[PDB]
Amino acid sequence: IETVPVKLKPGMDGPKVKQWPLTEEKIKALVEICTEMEKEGKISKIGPENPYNTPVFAIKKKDSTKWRKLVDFRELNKRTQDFWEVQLGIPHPAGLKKKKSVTVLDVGDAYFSVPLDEDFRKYTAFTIPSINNETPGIRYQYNVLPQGWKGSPAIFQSSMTKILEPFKKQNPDIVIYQYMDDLYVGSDLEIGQHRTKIEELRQHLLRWGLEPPFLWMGYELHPDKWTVQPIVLPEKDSWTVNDIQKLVGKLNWASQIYPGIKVRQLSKLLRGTKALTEVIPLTEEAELELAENREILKEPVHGVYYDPSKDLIAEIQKQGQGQWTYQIYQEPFKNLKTGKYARMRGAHTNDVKQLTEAVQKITTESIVIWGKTPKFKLPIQKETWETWWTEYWQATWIPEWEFVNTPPLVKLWYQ
Amino acid sequence: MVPISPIETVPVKLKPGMDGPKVKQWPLTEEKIKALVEICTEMEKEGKISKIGPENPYNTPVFAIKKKDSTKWRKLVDFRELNKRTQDFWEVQLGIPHPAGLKKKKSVTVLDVGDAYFSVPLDEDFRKYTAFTIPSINNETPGIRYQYNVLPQGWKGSPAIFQSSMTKILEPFAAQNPDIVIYQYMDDLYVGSDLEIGQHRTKIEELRQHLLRWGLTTPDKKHQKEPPFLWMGYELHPDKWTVQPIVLPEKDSWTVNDIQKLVGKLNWASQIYPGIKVRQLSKLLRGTKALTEVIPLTEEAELELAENREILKEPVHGVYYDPSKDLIAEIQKQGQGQWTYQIYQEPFKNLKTGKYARMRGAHTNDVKQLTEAVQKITTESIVIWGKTPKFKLPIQKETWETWWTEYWQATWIPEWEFVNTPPLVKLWYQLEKEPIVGAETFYVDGAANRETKLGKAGYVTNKGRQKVVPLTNTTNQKTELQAIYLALQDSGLEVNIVTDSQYALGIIQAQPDKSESELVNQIIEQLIKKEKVYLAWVPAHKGIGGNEQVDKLVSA
Numbered sequence: 001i002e003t004v005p006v007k008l009k010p011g012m013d014g015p016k017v018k019q020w021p022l023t024e025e026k027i028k029a030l031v032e033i034c035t036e037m038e039k040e041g042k043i044s045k046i047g048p049e050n051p052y053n054t055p056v057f058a059i060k061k062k063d064s065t066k067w068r069k070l071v072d073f074r075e076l077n078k079r080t081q082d083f084w085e086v087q088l089g090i091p092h093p094a095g096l097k098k099k100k101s102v103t104v105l106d107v108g109d110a111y112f113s114v115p116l117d118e119d120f121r122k123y124t125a126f127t128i129p130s131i132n133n134e135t136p137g138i139r140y141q142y143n144v145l146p147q148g149w150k151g152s153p154a155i156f157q158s159s160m161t162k163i164l165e166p167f168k169k170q171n172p173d174i175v176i177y178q179y180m181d182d183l184y185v186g187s188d189l190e191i192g193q194h195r196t197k198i199e200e201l202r203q204h205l206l207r208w209g210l211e212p213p214f215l216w217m218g219y220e221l222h223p224d225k226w227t228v229q230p231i232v233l234p235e236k237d238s239w240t241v242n243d244i245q246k247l248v249g250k251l252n253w254a255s256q257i258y259p260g261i262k263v264r265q266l267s268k269l270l271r272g273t274k275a276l277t278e279v280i281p282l283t284e285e286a287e288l289e290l291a292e293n294r295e296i297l298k299e300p301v302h303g304v305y306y307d308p309s310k311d312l313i314a315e316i317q318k319q320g321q322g323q324w325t326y327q328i329y330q331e332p333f334k335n336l337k338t339g340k341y342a343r344m345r346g347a348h349t350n351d352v353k354q355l356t357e358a359v360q361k362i363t364t365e366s367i368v369i370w371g372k373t374p375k376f377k378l379p380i381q382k383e384t385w386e387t388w389w390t391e392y393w394q395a396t397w398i399p400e401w402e403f404v405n406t407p408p409l410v411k412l413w414y415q
Numbered sequence: 416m417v418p419i420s421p422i423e424t425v426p427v428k429l430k431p432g433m434d435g436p437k438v439k440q441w442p443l444t445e446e447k448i449k450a451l452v453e454i455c456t457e458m459e460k461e462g463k464i465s466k467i468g469p470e471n472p473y474n475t476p477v478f479a480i481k482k483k484d485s486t487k488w489r490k491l492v493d494f495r496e497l498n499k500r501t502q503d504f505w506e507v508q509l510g511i512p513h514p515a516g517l518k519k520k521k522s523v524t525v526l527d528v529g530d531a532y533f534s535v536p537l538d539e540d541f542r543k544y545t546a547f548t549i550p551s552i553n554n555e556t557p558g559i560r561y562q563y564n565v566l567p568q569g570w571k572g573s574p575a576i577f578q579s580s581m582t583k584i585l586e587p588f589a590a591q592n593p594d595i596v597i598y599q600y601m602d603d604l605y606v607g608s609d610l611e612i613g614q615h616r617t618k619i620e621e622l623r624q625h626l627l628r629w630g631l632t633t634p635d636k637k638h639q640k641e642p643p644f645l646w647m648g649y650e651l652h653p654d655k656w657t658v659q660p661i662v663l664p665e666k667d668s669w670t671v672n673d674i675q676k677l678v679g680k681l682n683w684a685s686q687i688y689p690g691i692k693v694r695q696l697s698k699l700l701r702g703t704k705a706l707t708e709v710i711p712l713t714e715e716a717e718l719e720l721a722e723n724r725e726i727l728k729e730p731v732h733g734v735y736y737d738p739s740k741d742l743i744a745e746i747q748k749q750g751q752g753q754w755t756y757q758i759y760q761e762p763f764k765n766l767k768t769g770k771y772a773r774m775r776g777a778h779t780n781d782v783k784q785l786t787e788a789v790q791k792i793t794t795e796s797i798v799i800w801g802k803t804p805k806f807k808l809p810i811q812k813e814t815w816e817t818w819w820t821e822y823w824q825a826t827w828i829p830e831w832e833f834v835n836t837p838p839l840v841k842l843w844y845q846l847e848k849e850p851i852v853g854a855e856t857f858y859v860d861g862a863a864n865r866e867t868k869l870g871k872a873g874y875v876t877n878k879g880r881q882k883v884v885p886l887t888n889t890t891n892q893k894t895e896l897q898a899i900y901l902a903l904q905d906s907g908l909e910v911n912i913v914t915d916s917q918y919a920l921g922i923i924q925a926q927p928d929k930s931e932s933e934l935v936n937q938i939i940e941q942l943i944k945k946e947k948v949y950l951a952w953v954p955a956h957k958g959i960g961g962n963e964q965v966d967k968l969v970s971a
């Protein structure tokens with residue numbers, strides 16, 4: 001009810017980010033949402049003495065028909081002070097990734113109950129544009145904690161802990177983790193049980209609230225079943241020259257990750273100048289070297305550690321037929337997680353929708369495991385991505401990304 | 416009197432840490448001073464400025480300019496210094512409407528709101544910063560000191576504060592009269608509608624009565640400006656639009672600057688004149704920016720200019736947007752990385768046209784360029800009409816599916832249909848996914864000495880065919896490409912090729928059909944002639960048979 005003082009980082013002005021083009025349907029939806037938010041006092045019109053801006057658009061959360069306003073506070077979040085005043089941070093719970101079920105709740109509506117520091121409001125300015133710029137864009141700023149701003153869960157943290165105390169005391173084995181507008185609630189119960197504890201949890205908020213438009217939803221995960229991708233070599237009875245070349249190629253790449261990989265004896269099978277399709281019998285020396293490489297590849301990678309002060313990097317490869325491979329790392333060749341997807345999810349003919357869904361799932365896994373989002377290296381032209389990703393976005397956060405314009409050879413080895 | 420509502424003032428600040436201006440007022444002739452005193456006396460009576468004491472330490476210079484061919488002087492308060500120290504504002508006019516997104520209107524009336532501009536007060540706490548001084552006759556008394564009470568012309572914040580103040584006034588009238596449109600440009604309001612002229616003129620009078628609420632008067636003698644409107648380089652008519660006349664000059668010899676001005680006109684014309692081309696003329700601007708240098712026009716530039724004059728021989732007009740109908744966008748390949756498009760709703764009635772140019776880059780192909788043109792048109796269309804048009808593209812559905820299923824990047828094109836108008840975009844080659852049974856296997860390699868630039872390229876095959884070619888003025892990367900070229904030259908219609916060049920595979924896996932490197936272009940021309948080509952990669956210097964042999968031959 002009293003505002004927490006907030007500042008930007010030293011020597012750093014507010015965001016002045018261009019609003020990108022919006023479709024007619026998205027503009028209509030935002031005009032309706034913001035008219036209501038204005039009546040409720042959450043936002044207020046602003047004048048031309050405010051030159052700041054943050055992009056806004058609208059989405060439809062997974063499995064609903066109602067538009068949700070989404071502000072892209074990525075720039076403001078970079079420029080906002082860090083919040084260590086009461087807590088040097090919320091030590092990430094390592095047990096969350098080990099629960100059998102984790103439901104994600106959109107609790108962002110609760111933030112609207114806390115006023116925003118009067119001196120910081122100007123920096124949350126945004127614009128609803130008009131088609132063809134025929135009328136002046138509608139300019140607003142926030143009077144309360146905005147959804148999507150990193151300072152919102154920080155300022156509301158004291159209030160959230162108090163709301164949840166009765167539920168935590170009564171259910172001590174439940175892991176509850178908050179990231180931005182999301183609440184991740186993990187349990188080891190049978191799903192039927194689980195769904196009922198989640199519904200118990202909703203009521204604590206409804207009770208405190210007395211209506212949140214998306215609090216009823218629930219995104220169910222199962223991190224204990226999350227699959228990884230070790231390096232595996234083919235098992236064949238007939239090896240062509242081409243098969244062996246691909247094998248030696250993959251082993252050469254693996255040797256950057258695993259020390260004791262050897263290809264001497266396997267290369268020695270190719271002695272001469274043979275047709276690619278000619279079958280080569282494996283020598284005993286080559287079979288042994290191959291088996292020893294198999295054994296090496298069953299062990300973890302040496303010297304792999306997570307450092308919370310370094311960026312997480314996510315790379316994605318399109319493998320075809322709706323399949324995607326990805327790796328998360330901080331140092332080259334020190335993968336902290338690898339994976340593979342195959343579920344296009346209503347996108348069997350849209351590469352870009354598939355990639356957008358992959359980005360969201362990888363970000364979700366990254367939030368659960370380490371409590372922050374990775375920086376993506378996306379296999380797509382900037383202009384294509386920039387034009388379309390907002391059409392398929394269903395998360396309330398947005399990660400960072402860069403673009404890969406040269407085809408990686410490593411695609412072959414994660415196949 | 417009738418009470419009027421005040422216009423809320425916008426609070427204004429100087430940039431952090433800066434103070435107001437303190438500029439010395441030069442001296443002025445006795446003639447100019449007398450003129451300024453009379454002008455400023457009138458302005459003071461009108462409430463625009465007020466005399467101040469000597470405590471105010473700020474000052475901005477004032478000038479007197481002779482309005483040409485007249486005995487009347489005009490005043491100029493030069494706020495350049497204060498503007499550098501005034502905060503940034505929100506500028507609403509950055510994005511201007513495109514005529515192709517407008518709707519047809521039966522009537523459009525213009526209202527002069529020039530006098531309303533001076534009912535907009537300046538933030539009281541900022542006025543001290545606008546102080547200026549009229550020098551005294553012979554400098555024997557103190558100068559007359561004034562400051563502004565209203566938005567000064569030439570001050571940084573006046574355009575934004577004026578527009579935001581008019582918009583705020585107009586919002587309730589627009590919201591409660593959804594059958595009209597209102598647009599402000601300079602000192603004028605433009606009011607359009609589809610109402611019968613009687614109802615339309617009633618709305619206008621109601622708008623005048625609404626503006627009186629704030630004491631804003633509008634001339635009774637209605638505006639002299641009438642359709643067509645000359646606006647931001649366009650002609651706006653009630654039911655059509657075009658660009659203002661495009662006149663390409665005749666000239667025996669062309670200058671850098673002339674070509675820059677010619678291309679600018681051609682770019683401006685390309686938004687309604689179909690098929691404008693500017694590549695060969697823009698090539699003449701490569702690298703150089705000596706505005707007075709003369710450039711000989713290539714024969715290709717003279718044809719392009721000849722074609723453009725033909726296109727511009729007679730007027731073309733666009734139609735306005737009809738929201739009840741779909742948008743269609745049709746694209747054509749023009750050559751040399753140039754693409755042209757038309758956006759229409761009814762056949763043969765374009766809303767607008769445009770063009771797209773290949774991005775600078777080492778290697779490219781038609782499918783990537785078509786995709787990029789689609790992304791540009793989509794984004795432009797969201798801006799103007801708030802929706803994506805349905806595309807008519809010169810590429811076969813089967814070609815597109817082969818492309819995007821096999822391309823290493825994610826790519827997407829929205830709803831579209833094939834239009835069979837040459838030249839069609841196609842795939843010129845496609846590499847095999849598996850080695851080819853029965854086809855000779857070529858193991859290629861090249862190498863060059865970094866100092867003497869001498870190198871070798873060659874191959875060895877499973878049939879015993881071999882070649883090594885000595886090369887001069889070359890590099891490791893050039894010889895690796897040269898080796899692949901030789902294998903393509905010397906093989907039959909089906910061929911397996913084994914390379915250790917990661918560089919060569921990065922290029923070919925990007926599937927170019929045209930390159931800035933003539934060597935890559937030669938490789939492309941050989942690939943197009945083949946039936947089957949499988950390209951295999953192996954790591955260098957690992958004792959791989961075949962690769963090991965030829966590496967030794969070429970690095971010798």
Ligand SMILES: Cc1cc(/C=C/C#N)cc(C)c1Nc1ccnc(Nc2ccc(C#N)cc2)n1
Pocket residue numbers: 134512517518519520523596597598600605606607642643644645646651652653654735
């Ligand atoms: C942008 C704009 C510029 C001018 C003009 C500025 C100037 N000078 C006048 C108006 C009224 C507008 N605003 C809108 C909004 C929606 N449809 C239209 N259609 C429309 C406008 C003018 C004519 C005509 N003649 C025909 C149709 N205009």
Ligand SMILES: Oc1ccc(C(F)(F)F)cn1
Pocket residue numbers: 438439440441442476477
């Ligand atoms: O009256 C003036 C006009 C211009 C200047 C300047 F400094 F800008 F040159 C000073 N005094």
Ligand SMILES: [Mg+2]
Pocket residue numbers: 860861862955966970
């Ligand atoms: Mg070599």
